[PDB]
Amino acid sequence: NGIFNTRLSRTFGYTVKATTVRTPSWAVDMMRFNINDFVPPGGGTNKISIPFEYYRIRKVKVEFWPCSPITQGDRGVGSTAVILDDNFVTKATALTYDPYVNYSSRHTIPQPFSYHSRYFTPKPVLDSTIDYFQPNNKRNQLWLRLQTSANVDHVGLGTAFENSKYDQDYNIRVTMYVQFREFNLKDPPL
């Protein structure tokens, strides 16, 4: 039974710079998830540090851990929308409106110091021209080959943060819940 369900994680910093504009503006950005970040390159005869041929990403969880104190003023309200098709709102430093507010997948992120997370099933980008994705069915989900450096992108999450007179720091943990298949482990002698 090759099937092995594990959990993989990483963390990166993301900063919303302090702006001098008064009228409300939002900073727009995007998150793509590629497993090359999560699995280190292996060594020896085994190419990847995880000895399986196939994977498929079952659920992705994106935590927003703020670095800001609860005593920081000039609070604001952002929005986090799930983006399945790799069609993102263009990145912007200050945008007069919150573009993701009317997406059906939007959750609100209070700012700066509030904790926010989204938990959903991501989709791989199979053809950038067509941009098609599967419904969520755990049985029918496509299996993907695990490749050394060439792994495909999974497109999850757009975010729009309202600007502030202060810096807004988050520590974004991304935890993928992956399912691996086909134990491939190689064992040359000596």
Add this chain to the structure above:
Amino acid sequence: NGIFNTRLSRTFGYTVKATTVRTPSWAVDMMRFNINDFVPPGGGTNKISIPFEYYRIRKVKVEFWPCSPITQGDRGVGSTAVILDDNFVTKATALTYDPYVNYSSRHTIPQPFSYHSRYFTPKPVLDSTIDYFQPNNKRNQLWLRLQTSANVDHVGLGTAFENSKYDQDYNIRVTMYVQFREFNLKDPPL
């Protein structure tokens, strides 16, 4: 609940020219269905006049509305076959035989003045080299991104009309039953 089921329509003329040949011949043609025809380009910040990110075409209905009088002579018999894979019989003005008669998906169209329609589930052309399509399962149907001008073709319907000593005019209404997902509407101020 982003899911919104609507109905979209268009009409175009198609004419079978009068031929001088006596022995029975058939004129062969094809119908591809692209949603760029059905959805006008929007304006403002919203790109498409329908504020959704994703669609998938659930059913396509092709009506043949004849322009011919019921008193027109030299009647004939054609055939309408459903073509899933984008493999069509080459277009022809007069062809000695009816190429679609033995397709399992054939319905007969009596001519000139009889009303004919086909109602089926079309398939998008994902890779022109491989030409693969899904079975009909409403749950597992791929979602497609709605694009401004770049939307992919859905390949439905081949038709072979028997030639006549008279002109044969039809008004072909194409009504797609579409399902849209992810309300994306943008609202910049002022």
Add this chain to the structure above:
Amino acid sequence: NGIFNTRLSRTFGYTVKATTVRTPSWAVDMMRFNINDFVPPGGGTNKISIPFEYYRIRKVKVEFWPCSPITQGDRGVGSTAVILDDNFVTKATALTYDPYVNYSSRHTIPQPFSYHSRYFTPKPVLDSTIDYFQPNNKRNQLWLRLQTSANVDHVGLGTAFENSKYDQDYNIRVTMYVQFREFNLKDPPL
């Protein structure tokens, strides 16, 4: 089935200026809700970016998101009353008493940093002379035509904020829950 229930949103800033008066005073203001803010003007043959003829606003939700830190002193207590008839207490910078406290529809808003929201059914202003409105019955609610720039006002919400020795900033999100009828979408060729 033309009926389509969606959710539309916007955000604007509102500031209560710091005052030098000591004895308690309240600043009085009002909120009218017009859908022209929520729906951008469309483009092409379709006039509005939402392809429906008729709407009626089912529920309006007004969130008050404070920008103030939880460490800000000189707290106070305001009041938020629902105003159906477009009869508002006149706008005031400092008013010796809280005029909305005895309204039957009042909820309290703690200040500055507390989160406050009101969720209710608004009413359109049909005749400014008579000022009459319907009871809340989802079945008998009048349908309204969706107009480009001419849409009628819906009158919701009066608010009275107690003044403070400090500035009081809120980010007011207004989310209308609307029901649209009659898909009108136009599709000219080419």
Add this chain to the structure above:
Amino acid sequence: NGIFNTRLSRTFGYTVKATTVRTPSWAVDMMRFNINDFVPPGGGTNKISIPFEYYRIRKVKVEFWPCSPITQGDRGVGSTAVILDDNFVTKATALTYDPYVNYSSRHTIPQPFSYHSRYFTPKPVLDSTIDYFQPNNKRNQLWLRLQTSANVDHVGLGTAFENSKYDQDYNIRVTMYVQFREFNLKDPPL
């Protein structure tokens, strides 16, 4: 009812050359399955000798029929693993270890004279970059267009044979269980 389930077959020789090395080594090779081998090109107006538009390969059975006598010495033990993603162990004449032994899909082939077969569902190679394949669900399996010479590869089976001081001959029968759809047969007159 276009659906027609048939069985198609072919046979080719494969030889493991006798080696002079003593320490155990394995010879590594691979099997791809393309239907162009199984269906001869038709003639006349019908392009393929099987009058259907669409196929999908339900099961592939690979028999290993040895040519070796039961009295041949220097026996050994190989391994046969199912390879879904078109990621194969590189072909090798002598490899110090058996690379497929730890694959979850491995079955053992005793050698030289023992009969071995594997029976499984193969997968087409849709995109060589991404290398993704469906789960086994008979209902949701993609339909493929049957093409004259251009048919896509189905990637089944890796094999690693232990080397011997003698030649090892097998007759490999490959029997695909295919399901065809859409009777397309053409019948021009005369």
Add this chain to the structure above:
Amino acid sequence: NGIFNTRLSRTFGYTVKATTVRTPSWAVDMMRFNINDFVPPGGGTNKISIPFEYYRIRKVKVEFWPCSPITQGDRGVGSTAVILDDNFVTKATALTYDPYVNYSSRHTIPQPFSYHSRYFTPKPVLDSTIDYFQPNNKRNQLWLRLQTSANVDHVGLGTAFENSKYDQDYNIRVTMYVQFREFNLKDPPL
């Protein structure tokens, strides 16, 4: 399970010339059905485009599709009788009486513009001297070898059309419902 039930079709024109005689006359003709018309000759190693050894024709359906307008005058009444034994009324341009009217198998065809069809089980001509045929029993029906050009005749249908002062054109579609046995497909290499 070699048994495969398909449907095969063809169309040919048949014309009843306009006659100057006034008193009622009937034009008498016959229809024999040979599968050489329905199956094109294959190519390559496979002789017939349908890869089966044996067939037996289960049902034959003969449609009469008129080319005449519904406004054409001088209507008349013909007769269509099923002829099992290959004993036909001799072909005639004008015959004073309708010879098929008293056959027990007669159906009436109204003329010119009425649609007429007969659906029955045909019989092969085994010996022209004896002219014997089987009862209709689906289990006991003789199997016939499918031959390239030499296939035997199946004798269905006599028809007698009343003459008219105008031309009477029909498009006669013949759809055989056949059952094939023994998949014989050949696959030479390369």
Add this chain to the structure above:
Amino acid sequence: NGIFNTRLSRTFGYTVKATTVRTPSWAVDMMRFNINDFVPPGGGTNKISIPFEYYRIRKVKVEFWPCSPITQGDRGVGSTAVILDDNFVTKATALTYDPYVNYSSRHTIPQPFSYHSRYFTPKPVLDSTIDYFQPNNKRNQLWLRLQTSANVDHVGLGTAFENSKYDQDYNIRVTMYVQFREFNLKDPPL
């Protein structure tokens, strides 16, 4: 749930040299099982190619695959006993008696060409002085740390082969059924 049950394998050659002695003699040898053979050293930040901290070996299966032809004469009878405590009969080229025949754990191996296997639970050597081992209880089995090169020995299997006038070649596959705990995988950036 860190627990992951996998299967690991290796193969090595073992040869019983042909002897000139006539009276029956047995060649005595032993098999120790160390996981350093089964798991290759990893690369990068992860030390072992299997990303788990702890293992315990649940069952070991030792297959004897003969290289000898079924036509080889001078057959004999050996014995395979399970040795838990790392107390082995001293290795011998020819020993007048079969020392393992009276062990309670003995199974017979017919020779040369017969297939023989033993399947049991091995024990690690914790203290070479005391030589103590646990009963077989799947719940109470000690967990062992997985170490790069330092892993402890598991002591399974003694074997005594009767000598022959011919060479006796076996290919010994050793398949450990292991249970791993505590996913430790490391993922440094870039």
